[model samples]
Target: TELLKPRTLADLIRILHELFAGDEVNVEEVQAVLEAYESNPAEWALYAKFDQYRYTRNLVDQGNGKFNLMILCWGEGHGSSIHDHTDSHGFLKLLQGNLKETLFDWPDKKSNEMIKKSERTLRENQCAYINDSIGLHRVENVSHTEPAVSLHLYSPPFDTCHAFDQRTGHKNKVTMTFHSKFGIRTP
Candidate 1:
């Protein structure tokens, strides 16, 4: 039997639905699926609307409680705070420009100090995955003069997550919001 490959945004969403059709999703399987696709800007470029101040999250597909597929546009120097994935699994696939993923260790039990673990750079078409068990992380566009874009998939979608203050290790609950849905900008 021949394997089906996704060549467009719609095709990728369809494959995601099928992958999550069962009760569980295998992380390795999803990563493989994302890695197989070539980056085609024409299919998702319309939703990659870069914001001047902060990163923009544009919803591509909402799977009820199964998952969420979104396109995140990061303006130059934009990045996420150190954050946990809650109870969901996250997979990020770089679509344009370059991004850097910095992994941090979970806070110490007593001092609550957050420590850095490692860092890696992601170019277009590269995919990465994480969960609460993997520890916390912050992602940023490495380029100061260019914008970056990435596709994110969160299984068993979540509305909120914990963002940690790197200096004091203070934790803040942040409610995730979309900048747009289905290619339409949101207010």
Candidate 2:
């Protein structure tokens, strides 16, 4: 009974809005909607984008457990560091282009070699998850000439995240940011 095949872009957003209207969110609830949403036309006009760099733009943001929504724009060959989402549960829907992620497991802090746990490509309309457990990974645009776009939702939104270095096996705390808010580009 949790699955919904949204009839329109507005319908899909409403489905998301209602799902997070509660005090607690189940991963299954978020995942199910993303898995079934109709993909035609993608409704990318609901968000803003840039081409000079990869950026994360916030569509919905509220304090605490309410949930946050954002869209990530990736320029050709751009990628995110191997990182973890400050214990927040995240769901990402690929709207355009292609991306790939690599999960890492380094045995020791002194070693630079990254042990690959899993690697897969996300094509258009595919969705993926990031939890406290599967949080350590790097996301990259797979093509040098093509850009990528993805929508993300996070419950218990993160204020800070740790980015891991493959060469040093070190983690750095990164303050979060948004290139835009509410579909408008920010200064």
Candidate 3:
């Protein structure tokens, strides 16, 4: 039997570290891992937190630039601004509640106006993939009273990315911050 099933946060981290320790990060393999690994809220309960003002980004493990894992907690009615993943690859697995992901095409080259492509609602245990090549997106919690939690994975972690204005498509670089790290809240 193979030790592929991850029952805890540490187990998942170990698995990801081994997978990304190689020269290149295999997109398919990483996605498969995330899909196969069941969500265990108890394993990450300490790191799962919500804010009234916005969604929370909690860092789980920073794999020395190979990749980074995060647990995002979204309050009811919370959503992100349209944004791109910079040059990195991203994956999101819903841990609890439902989330709506709105996909948009790249801003027009001439007018720089943002265009909507499509959207989808994801439920618990479902996973989604995104990258710069796939264009930009805005993630929102679909519930009015329930909060949402998601696990995110990013390769070659980035510190800053552009967030676009919905109407004008004007973009501004924003720094990413963590609400917590390894079950501890950041100051």
Candidate 4:
């Protein structure tokens, strides 16, 4: 099926305004947006090919405390390390290819460990929500054949985030930076 029309930066902002207007998060509303996009897969496939990361077409949508939206393009083999938003709420919409999300939960603040909560594959036009209380997770392309692209939205936008190194068991507070092309720094 053909995907929805390619969304301009402005169009995306307007959608966000409506989706988050009540200041009340609703998973169903987000799901509806995803379903609309999923119904038309061709549009998203075309958008995935845009190489804005290296040129003038790069776009980043910045907002005040209300929310911030970001579009990301991942080269093959690129993925993010395990991390948490501290006290933030987040939603991610997969725009192209596929991603594997691994969620974690800690029994208590002093557990000093994370329990594997769930893992799922997010296909194009699918969305996931994460809140301060339930956001310990990591995401990856895990696709040997194609690159992945996604859109991320965060409420009460923040300038810092926390990342963890599960292998080394080390943790650190990190400052978040915006990229003119990708929107957020990734490893």
Q: Pick the candidate with the highest TM-score.
A: 1
How many collisions between residues are there in candidate 1? 0
- Estimate, for each residue in 1-187, the C-alpha lDDT of model 3 and write its tens digit: 1338666668778888888887787787777777777888888798898788999999988887788899999999898989999899999999889999999988875656677799999888888999999989999996998899999999888879999988888889999999999889896
- Give the TM-scores of the predictions, in the order they appear: 0.95, 0.86, 0.94, 0.72
Candidate 2 has what TM-score? 0.86
Rank by TM-score, highest first: 1, 3, 2, 4
> What alpha-carbon RMSD in Å does predicted model 1 have with respect to the real structure?
1.5
Query: What is the full ranking by lDDT, best candidate first?
Result: 1, 3, 2, 4
Instruction: For model 1, give the 10-residue run with minimal summed lDDT.
Output: 1-10
lDDT of 1 by residue, 1-187 (tens): 1237787777878888888888898888888888777889899977988789999999989975699999999999999999999889999999888999999888865656677899999889999999989989999986988899999999988879999988868888999999999999998
In candidate 1, which residue pairs clash?
Answer: none
Better of 2 and 3 by lDDT: 3
In model 4, pairs of residues that clash are: 2-40, 3-40, 3-41
Residue 174, candidate 2: Cα error in Å is: 0.6
Whole-model lDDT values for every prediction: 0.88, 0.74, 0.87, 0.62
Model 1 misplacement above 4 A:
1-3
Query: Model 4 Cα displacement at 62 (Å)?
Result: 2.4
**How would you encode candidate 2's per-residue C-alpha lDDT over 1-187 as one tens digit per residue?**
4667877656777787778777777778778787677565446555646658665565644423577777788888888888887777888888788889888763365757666789999877788887767647888986988878877888787768888878777888988778777777776
Q: In the order shown, what is each candidate's alpha-carbon RMSD?
A: 1.5, 2.4, 1.8, 5.8
